[PDB]
Amino acid sequence: IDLEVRSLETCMYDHKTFSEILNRVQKAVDDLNLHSYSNLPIWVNKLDMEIERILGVRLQAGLRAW
Amino acid sequence: PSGKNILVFGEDGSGKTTLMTKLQHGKKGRGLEYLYLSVHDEDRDDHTRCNVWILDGDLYHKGLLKFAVSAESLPETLVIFVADMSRPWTVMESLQKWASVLREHIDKMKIPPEKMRELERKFVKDFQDYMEPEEGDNVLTHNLGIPVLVVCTKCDAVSVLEKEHDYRDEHLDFIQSHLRRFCLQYGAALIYTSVKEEKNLDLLYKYIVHFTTPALVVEKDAVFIPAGWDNEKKIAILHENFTTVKPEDAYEDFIVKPPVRKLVHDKELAAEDEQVFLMKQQSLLAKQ
Amino acid sequence: RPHIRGAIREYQTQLIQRVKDDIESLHDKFKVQYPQSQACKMSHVRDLPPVSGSIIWAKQIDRQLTAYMKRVEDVLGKGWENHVEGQKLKQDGDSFRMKLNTQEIFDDWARKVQQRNLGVSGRIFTIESTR
Amino acid sequence: SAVMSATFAKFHPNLVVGGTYSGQIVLWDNRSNKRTPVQRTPLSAAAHTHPVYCVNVVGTQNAHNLISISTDGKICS
């Protein structure tokens, strides 16, 4: 998860690759769902908030450059 | 005819992308989603360059309004307030939400042009005297005066709403009294529209942004109030016919049936979490 | 017979990767939901309530998984979870099965139906109702 | 626990068997990249509850087993 998360500022401005990353991450999330851990959606809320920040940050950076 | 402008206030779906689609779409997630109208110039189309603007949300889109409202844009500024019928309670207040945003924008962008203060207020005193004649005294109107208009959308859901919870002429009369009331105060008019209905829109804009039409408050399943088709008594009889006469809390009535419906998908649980050392010594105290 | 049973592990693993991939496909397709399943639309054209078609979907998926499980144990012998992989596939099929016990849908939906039943289901009270 | 004995596995080019000090028999894998054995023998009486100094595979492809012989005095295929 974290290699994807920490790699969210690596593949510069490619929506396909972004999509791919997210899909992989939630594949791991269904793995988490099956052998259900305790409060999984709560931790996902956390994730998503920081993902939004890395996203919007890469966005605004590319926004200025564009 | 020069560069014309329009400032519609896109409100969370409410068929706004569909409003310009029914009028004439990439995506709607950014706001300020410009559109340009260049329609028939009363005999042909002389490119009636009526630039549209559609904001949605509230996150500091003031500077975007600067990019949509200049100092010379001011005359040809047909602001259009758009709201749905799926959530009429939103409309009731959210109209004033958008309104107050523009009230700020009046005293934030028109504060340097002081010529239309002493000019446009008198021109509005001219203008709103013309709001009423040749259509078909005094009303507690507002400070906002420039070409303004309040429209509604999502109206072909009437039977769906009475199917859910309206089924009362109070619910239908009270909203229209507040709407027509809003518009007459605001120096505007009240217009409705629906899914595959009511091409009465361009009539008033083309008619105003320079073709006239006779009004309707008759059907009451779809309403068209041009400016000056008001008083403060016809509507008073309308919210009198068993409608709880002028209730100043029933905002919660229609702002209670589907907004204070419930929350289906809600996960505020704070489910569980425990300790280690704590449990261990607590069991030590439990060892006796 | 252990004598026989010894020389088949290679073929066993070939079959396990087959079973593996198909249960993985079940995770995929079931991870897409019934409302967005196109099967819901076709089933709806075949005229079922969405409640029924949803649990039919669920229950059928369950039957495919159970058929796979019996395929697994017939291939891997009855000592099957004791085997290195069988324990894993057991756990996975069990949790996947726990994410398929749809009686709650009938519960909550029966409550909504009961809520509607309070004054709608027997509305013959005005055979020719005024309007 | 302390591995008291270890060796490879017969016709398992990815596995490593192992004896311990506790008595459990472990089983590591290289291709999984799990620095912990994936199949640990229980500590039941049916298993070894004493260190196994000599645990070994025996025959060929179909002639094999795994015989663990702890110091307790038990053999277990």
Add this chain to the structure above:
Amino acid sequence: XXXXXXXXXXXXXXXXXXXXXXXXXXXXXXXXXXXXXXXXXXXXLEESYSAVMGIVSEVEQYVKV
């Protein structure tokens, strides 16, 4: 051409939230149905980069006509 520059400056106004895009999330799914995918990322998120990257060009398209 000054109006075209005004459109370029309109795109320059995208720094409104000052390198944050705090509200950058736009979609919401339906209610509860039957799902093992209990915690998908965000119905509002996945499409937002392509959405922004496209709407940037979209405004430029509408100004051109």
